[PDB]
Coordinates of N, CA and C and ligand atoms in Angstrom, one line a residue:
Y18 N -12.7 -16.1 11.7 CA -12.5 -17.2 12.8 C -10.8 -17.7 13.1
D19 N -10.0 -16.6 12.7 CA -8.5 -16.8 11.8 C -7.8 -16.8 13.5
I20 N -7.2 -18.1 13.9 CA -6.5 -18.9 15.4 C -5.6 -17.9 15.2
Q21 N -4.8 -17.1 14.1 CA -3.5 -16.7 14.1 C -2.9 -14.9 14.2
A22 N -4.1 -14.7 14.0 CA -4.8 -12.9 13.0 C -4.1 -12.1 14.5
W23 N -4.3 -12.9 15.6 CA -3.5 -12.1 16.9 C -2.3 -10.7 16.6
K24 N -1.6 -12.3 16.3 CA 0.0 -11.9 16.1 C 0.2 -10.3 15.4
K25 N -0.2 -10.6 14.1 CA 0.0 -9.1 13.1 C -1.0 -7.9 13.7
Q26 N -2.3 -8.2 14.1 CA -2.9 -7.3 15.3 C -1.6 -6.4 16.3
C27 N -1.2 -7.3 17.1 CA -0.6 -6.7 18.7 C 1.1 -6.1 17.6
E28 N 1.7 -6.2 16.7 CA 2.5 -6.3 15.5 C 2.0 -4.4 15.7
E29 N 1.2 -4.3 15.1 CA 0.9 -3.5 15.0 C 0.2 -2.5 15.9
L30 N -0.2 -3.0 16.6 CA -0.6 -2.1 18.2 C 0.4 -2.0 18.5
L31 N 1.8 -2.8 19.1 CA 2.9 -2.0 19.5 C 3.2 -1.1 18.4
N32 N 3.0 -1.0 16.6 CA 4.1 0.0 15.9 C 2.9 1.6 16.4
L33 N 1.7 1.2 17.3 CA 1.2 2.8 17.0 C 1.8 3.5 18.7
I34 N 1.4 2.0 19.6 CA 2.5 3.0 21.4 C 4.3 3.0 20.7
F35 N 4.1 2.5 19.7 CA 5.7 3.4 20.0 C 6.2 4.7 19.6
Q36 N 5.1 5.0 17.9 CA 4.9 6.3 18.2 C 4.2 7.6 18.5
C37 N 3.8 6.4 19.9 CA 3.2 7.3 21.0 C 4.4 8.0 22.0
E38 N 4.3 9.2 21.9 CA 5.2 10.2 22.8 C 5.1 9.5 24.7
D39 N 3.6 8.9 25.0 CA 3.5 8.9 26.1 C 4.5 6.9 26.1
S40 N 5.0 6.7 25.3 CA 5.5 5.5 25.4 C 7.3 5.4 26.2
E41 N 7.5 6.7 25.5 CA 8.8 7.0 25.8 C 9.8 6.4 27.0
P42 N 9.0 6.7 28.4 CA 9.3 6.2 29.5 C 9.3 4.6 29.3
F43 N 8.8 4.2 28.7 CA 8.3 2.4 28.5 C 8.8 1.3 27.8
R44 N 10.1 2.1 26.3 CA 10.5 1.5 25.6 C 11.1 0.6 25.6
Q45 N 12.1 0.7 27.2 CA 13.0 -0.1 27.2 C 13.0 0.1 28.3
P46 N 13.6 -1.2 29.1 CA 14.1 -1.0 30.7 C 14.1 -0.3 31.4
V47 N 13.6 -0.1 32.6 CA 13.7 1.1 33.6 C 15.1 1.7 33.2
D48 N 15.7 2.2 33.6 CA 17.1 2.1 33.8 C 17.9 2.3 35.2
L49 N 18.2 1.4 35.8 CA 18.7 0.8 37.3 C 19.0 2.0 37.8
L50 N 20.4 2.8 36.8 CA 21.5 4.3 37.5 C 21.0 5.1 37.7
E51 N 19.5 4.9 36.9 CA 18.6 6.7 37.0 C 17.3 6.1 38.7
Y52 N 17.3 4.5 38.7 CA 16.4 4.7 40.0 C 16.7 4.1 40.9
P53 N 18.3 3.4 41.4 CA 18.7 2.1 42.1 C 18.0 1.5 43.0
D54 N 17.4 1.5 43.5 CA 16.2 1.1 44.4 C 15.0 0.4 43.1
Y55 N 15.0 0.4 42.4 CA 13.8 0.1 41.8 C 13.2 -1.7 41.7
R56 N 14.8 -2.3 41.3 CA 14.1 -3.5 41.7 C 14.0 -4.0 43.6
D57 N 14.2 -3.3 44.6 CA 13.6 -3.1 46.0 C 12.3 -3.3 45.8
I58 N 11.5 -2.9 44.8 CA 9.8 -2.1 44.8 C 9.4 -3.8 43.8
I59 N 10.2 -3.5 42.6 CA 9.8 -4.4 41.5 C 10.4 -5.5 41.3
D60 N 9.8 -6.6 41.4 CA 10.1 -7.7 41.5 C 10.2 -8.9 39.6
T61 N 9.6 -8.0 38.9 CA 9.3 -8.5 37.6 C 9.4 -7.4 36.5
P62 N 10.2 -7.0 36.3 CA 10.5 -5.3 35.1 C 10.2 -6.0 33.5
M63 N 9.2 -5.1 33.4 CA 8.8 -5.2 31.7 C 8.5 -4.5 31.3
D64 N 9.2 -4.1 30.4 CA 8.5 -2.6 29.1 C 8.3 -3.1 27.2
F65 N 7.8 -2.6 26.7 CA 7.5 -2.7 25.3 C 8.4 -3.2 24.3
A66 N 9.8 -3.0 24.5 CA 10.9 -3.5 23.9 C 10.8 -5.5 24.5
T67 N 10.5 -5.3 25.3 CA 10.9 -7.0 25.8 C 9.7 -7.5 25.3
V68 N 8.5 -6.4 25.0 CA 7.1 -7.9 24.7 C 7.4 -8.1 22.8
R69 N 7.7 -6.5 22.2 CA 7.8 -7.0 21.2 C 8.8 -8.0 20.7
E70 N 10.2 -7.8 21.6 CA 10.9 -9.2 21.1 C 9.9 -10.5 21.8
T71 N 9.5 -10.4 22.5 CA 8.7 -12.1 22.6 C 7.9 -12.5 21.7
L72 N 6.9 -11.4 21.4 CA 6.0 -11.8 20.1 C 7.2 -12.4 18.9
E73 N 7.7 -11.4 18.8 CA 8.7 -12.0 17.7 C 9.6 -13.4 17.4
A74 N 10.4 -13.3 18.0 CA 10.4 -14.9 18.9 C 9.8 -16.0 19.4
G75 N 8.6 -15.7 18.3 CA 7.3 -16.4 18.7 C 7.6 -17.2 20.2
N76 N 7.5 -16.5 21.0 CA 7.4 -16.8 22.4 C 6.2 -16.7 23.4
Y77 N 5.2 -15.8 22.8 CA 3.8 -16.0 23.0 C 2.9 -16.7 22.5
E78 N 1.8 -17.8 23.5 CA 1.2 -18.4 22.8 C -0.3 -17.8 22.3
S79 N -0.6 -17.0 22.9 CA -1.6 -16.1 22.7 C -2.0 -14.5 23.1
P80 N -3.2 -14.3 22.4 CA -2.5 -12.5 22.8 C -2.4 -12.8 24.2
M81 N -3.5 -13.2 25.2 CA -3.7 -12.9 26.6 C -2.7 -12.5 27.5
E82 N -1.2 -13.9 27.0 CA -0.2 -13.8 27.8 C 0.7 -12.4 27.2
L83 N 0.2 -11.7 26.0 CA 0.8 -10.5 25.1 C 0.3 -9.6 27.0
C84 N -1.1 -9.5 26.9 CA -1.9 -8.5 27.6 C -1.5 -8.5 28.8
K85 N -1.3 -9.5 29.6 CA -0.4 -9.6 30.8 C 0.7 -9.3 31.1
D86 N 1.8 -9.1 30.3 CA 3.4 -8.9 30.1 C 2.7 -7.0 30.3
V87 N 2.5 -6.3 28.7 CA 2.0 -5.4 29.0 C 0.9 -4.7 29.9
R88 N 0.0 -5.1 30.7 CA -0.5 -4.8 31.7 C 0.6 -4.3 32.8
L89 N 1.5 -5.6 33.1 CA 2.7 -6.2 34.1 C 3.4 -4.6 33.7
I90 N 4.0 -3.9 32.6 CA 4.2 -2.7 32.4 C 3.8 -1.3 33.2
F91 N 2.2 -1.2 33.4 CA 1.2 -0.1 34.0 C 1.5 -0.7 35.4
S92 N 1.4 -2.0 35.8 CA 0.9 -2.2 37.6 C 2.5 -1.4 38.0
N93 N 3.6 -2.1 37.3 CA 5.3 -1.3 37.7 C 5.0 -0.1 37.5
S94 N 4.6 0.8 36.5 CA 4.8 2.5 36.9 C 3.5 2.6 38.1
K95 N 3.0 1.7 38.2 CA 1.7 2.7 39.5 C 2.3 2.2 40.9
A96 N 2.8 1.1 40.9 CA 4.1 0.6 41.9 C 5.6 1.4 42.4
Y97 N 5.5 1.7 41.5 CA 7.0 2.3 41.8 C 6.5 4.4 42.2
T98 N 5.7 4.8 41.6 CA 5.2 6.1 41.6 C 5.1 6.5 42.8
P99 N 6.4 7.5 43.3 CA 6.4 8.2 44.5 C 4.9 8.9 44.8
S100 N 4.1 9.4 43.2 CA 2.8 10.4 43.5 C 2.2 9.5 43.1
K101 N 1.0 10.0 42.2 CA -0.3 9.4 41.5 C -0.8 10.5 40.5
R102 N 0.2 12.0 41.0 CA 0.3 12.6 39.7 C 1.2 13.3 39.1
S103 N 2.6 11.9 39.5 CA 3.8 12.3 39.0 C 3.9 12.1 37.1
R104 N 4.6 12.4 36.9 CA 4.7 13.0 35.3 C 4.9 10.9 34.8
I105 N 5.8 10.4 34.9 CA 5.5 9.5 34.2 C 4.5 8.5 34.6
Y106 N 4.1 8.1 35.6 CA 2.5 7.3 35.6 C 1.8 8.3 35.1
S107 N 1.5 9.4 35.1 CA 0.3 10.0 34.1 C 0.2 9.5 32.9
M108 N 1.6 9.0 32.2 CA 1.8 9.1 31.2 C 1.0 7.8 30.5
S109 N 1.4 7.0 31.9 CA 1.5 5.2 31.5 C -0.7 5.4 31.9
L110 N -1.1 5.7 32.4 CA -2.9 6.3 32.3 C -3.2 6.1 31.5
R111 N -2.4 7.4 30.8 CA -3.3 7.4 29.0 C -2.8 6.2 28.9
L112 N -1.3 5.7 27.9 CA -1.0 4.9 27.5 C -1.5 3.2 27.8
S113 N -2.4 3.5 29.0 CA -3.1 1.8 29.5 C -4.5 2.3 28.9
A114 N -5.0 3.5 28.8 CA -6.2 3.6 28.2 C -6.5 3.4 26.8
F115 N -4.9 3.8 26.0 CA -5.0 3.5 24.4 C -4.7 1.9 24.3
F116 N -4.1 1.5 24.7 CA -3.9 0.1 25.0 C -5.4 -1.5 25.4
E117 N -5.9 -0.5 26.2 CA -7.1 -1.0 26.7 C -7.8 -0.8 25.2
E118 N -8.1 0.0 24.9 CA -9.4 0.2 23.5 C -9.1 -0.2 22.1
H119 N -7.7 -0.7 22.0 CA -7.6 -1.3 21.0 C -6.9 -2.9 21.3
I120 N -6.6 -3.4 22.4 CA -6.6 -4.7 22.8 C -8.1 -5.9 22.6
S121 N -9.4 -5.2 22.5 CA -10.6 -5.4 23.7 C -10.7 -6.4 22.3
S122 N -10.9 -6.0 21.5 CA -11.5 -7.2 19.7 C -10.5 -7.8 19.9
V123 N -9.2 -7.5 19.8 CA -7.9 -8.6 19.4 C -8.0 -9.9 20.1
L124 N -8.8 -9.6 21.5 CA -8.8 -10.5 22.3 C -10.2 -11.0 22.5
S125 N -11.3 -9.9 22.0 CA -12.3 -11.1 21.6 C -12.2 -11.7 20.2
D126 N -11.6 -11.7 19.3 CA -11.7 -12.7 17.9 C -10.8 -13.4 17.7
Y127 N -9.7 -13.5 19.1 CA -9.2 -15.0 19.1 C -9.7 -15.6 19.7
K128 N -11.0 -15.2 21.1 CA -11.1 -16.0 22.4 C -12.7 -16.9 21.0
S129 N -13.0 -16.2 20.2 CA -14.4 -16.1 19.0 C -13.9 -17.8 18.3
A130 N -12.7 -17.7 18.0 CA -11.6 -18.3 16.8 C -11.7 -19.5 17.2
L131 N -11.3 -19.6 19.1 CA -10.6 -20.7 19.8 C -12.1 -21.5 19.1
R132 N -13.0 -20.4 19.9 CA -14.2 -21.0 20.4 C -14.9 -22.0 19.1
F133 N -14.7 -21.4 18.1 CA -15.0 -21.7 16.5 C -14.1 -23.2 16.0
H134 N -12.9 -23.2 16.9 CA -12.3 -24.0 16.7 C -12.4 -25.3 17.0
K135 N -13.3 -25.5 18.1 CA -13.7 -26.1 19.0 C -15.7 -26.5 19.0
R136 N -15.9 -25.5 17.9 CA -18.1 -25.3 18.3 C -17.8 -27.7 17.3
Ligands
LIG215 O1 3.8 -15.8 28.8 C1 3.6 -14.0 29.1 C2 5.4 -13.7 30.0 N1 5.1 -13.2 30.7 C3 5.6 -13.3 32.4 C4 7.3 -13.3 32.2 C5 7.6 -11.8 32.1 C6 9.2 -12.0 32.6 C7 9.9 -12.7 32.6 C8 9.5 -14.0 32.8 C9 7.5 -14.6 32.7 C10 5.0 -13.1 33.4 C11 4.2 -11.7 33.5 C12 3.5 -11.2 34.8 C13 3.7 -11.8 36.1 C14 4.8 -13.0 36.2 C15 5.4 -13.1 35.0 C16 3.4 -13.8 30.9

């Protein structure tokens, strides 16, 4: 029932995501010189360095907020891909499955801790 435990759990999951070769296209903001039309399609860029920095700044109040930003990395990849068979998008799908598999217990434990706090 530790209400704060999610933070270190998210730091550890971000460390694993950074070791994953599938995260390379998503570690830093999409290069606007490489993809000059990016901002015509994507309204809110997001990347894993921005997520890690937001967490370390103490600017996430819950793991649900972190999850919303990580899911935005994947929805941006899906919205920008010219094809559902493209390399970068294909990497995003594997990384998303890995993320969802690991974040589920982080979210469940946090929500359970908050419910216990208000028991
Ligand atoms: O609390 C976290 C910060 N995330 C938002 C956000 C992302 C970038 C800049 C400002 C704010 C957001 C995510 C996805 C859609 C729209 C906004 C949710």
